[PDB]
Ligand binder design. Structure first.
Ligand SMILES: C[C@H](C(=O)Nc1ncc(SCc2ncc(C(C)(C)C)o2)s1)c1ccccc1
Length: 287
């Protein structure tokens, strides 16, 4: 798009290449996403245009704002509000001291408000990860790449129902991913760092126990469930996320329920006692 000047490659994500750009008209600095070029053959599917157009209306302070959608030269460009840092870089920068618990809590609470909004509109993220969570100097955290999955790789934050081949998975998949991110902020280590789908599944089973019909009715009927799966016993949360307090552990336990129907919703998670003393601290950001 001739109305923009590329400043730097922000990165090469899942939906193409992302650039920091300046809008030659308004002077605004934005994030520009080129949705497929070497893979894109035709002139963008009609149903993809309509789903992206619906996303431009999904406006919330905890969602990276989609400013514009440019369908020109039969290619697709998404213009997003720009944020200077992501949670992965912030966690890497904070690994020696750890993110202070009040900021972890503020980030978790805001992302749960973001998810509550999306979920009320029947919109799922489906691929939540530290790299997709954008932060600013004012203490805000925002969901980026929201709803792009139905419009058109790291397995660490994948819900078990996805790994077991459930085709019609729900909003509970985002709650699972956010619980994994919560555990990671607390411990300064990924909860389930799998490098294959089976390794991902087996790491979940080693910590939370191999699921069965007792904890998850219908699990043995899942597409990729195998009766030959090894049977591991569950481990206590006190071993999984020390030194997280009991309110935090209780909330995490509910975000990591096997059964998607028992997993806490974003709305109910916001009422959890863990957020009784939530505040909005400001991070130490070196840009
Ligand atoms: C972390 C930050 C950054 O990515 N800022 C940004 N602001 C707004 C943005 S569009 C949302 C989005 N689409 C795709 C993404 C990635 C690939 C980064 C996950 O994110 S992406 C940054 C990275 C590298 C250099 C400067 C800024």
């Amino acid at each position: 798009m001739e109305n923009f000047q590329k400043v730097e490659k922000i990165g090469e994500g899942t939906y193409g290449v992302v650039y920091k750009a300046r809008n030659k008209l308004t002077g605004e600095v934005v994030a520009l996403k080129k949705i497929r070029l070497d893979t894109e053959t035709e002139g963008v599917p009609s149903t993809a245009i309509r789903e992206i157009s619906l996303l431009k209306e999904l406006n919330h302070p905890n969602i990276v704002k989609l400013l514009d959608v440019i369908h020109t030269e039969n290619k697709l460009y998404l213009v997003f509000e720009f944020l200077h840092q992501d949670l992965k870089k912030f966690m890497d920068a904070s690994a020696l001291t750890g993110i202070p618990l009040p900021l972890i809590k503020s980030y978790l609470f805001q992302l749960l408000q973001g998810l509550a909004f999306c979920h009320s509109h029947r919109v799922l993220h489906r691929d939540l990860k530290p790299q997709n969570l954008l932060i600013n100097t004012e203490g805000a955290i925002k969901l980026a790449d929201f709803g792009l999955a139905r419009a058109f790789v790291t397995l660490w934050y994948r819900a078990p129902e996805i790994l077991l081949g459930c085709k019609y998975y729900s909003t509970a998949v985002d709650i699972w991913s956010l619980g994994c991110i919560f555990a990671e902020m607390v411990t300064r280590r990924a909860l389930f760092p799998g490098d294959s789908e089976i390794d991902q599944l087996f790491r979940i089973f080693r910590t939370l126990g191999t699921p069965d019909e007792v904890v998850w009715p219908g699990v043995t009927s899942m597409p990729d469930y195998k009766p030959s799966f090894p049977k591991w016993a569950r481990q206590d949360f006190s071993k999984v996320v020390p030194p997280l307090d009991e309110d935090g552990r209780s909330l995490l336990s509910q975000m990591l329920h096997y059964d998607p129907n028992k997993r806490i919703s974003a709305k109910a998670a916001l009422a959890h006692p863990f957020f009784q003393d939530v505040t909005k601290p400001v991070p130490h950001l070196r840009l």
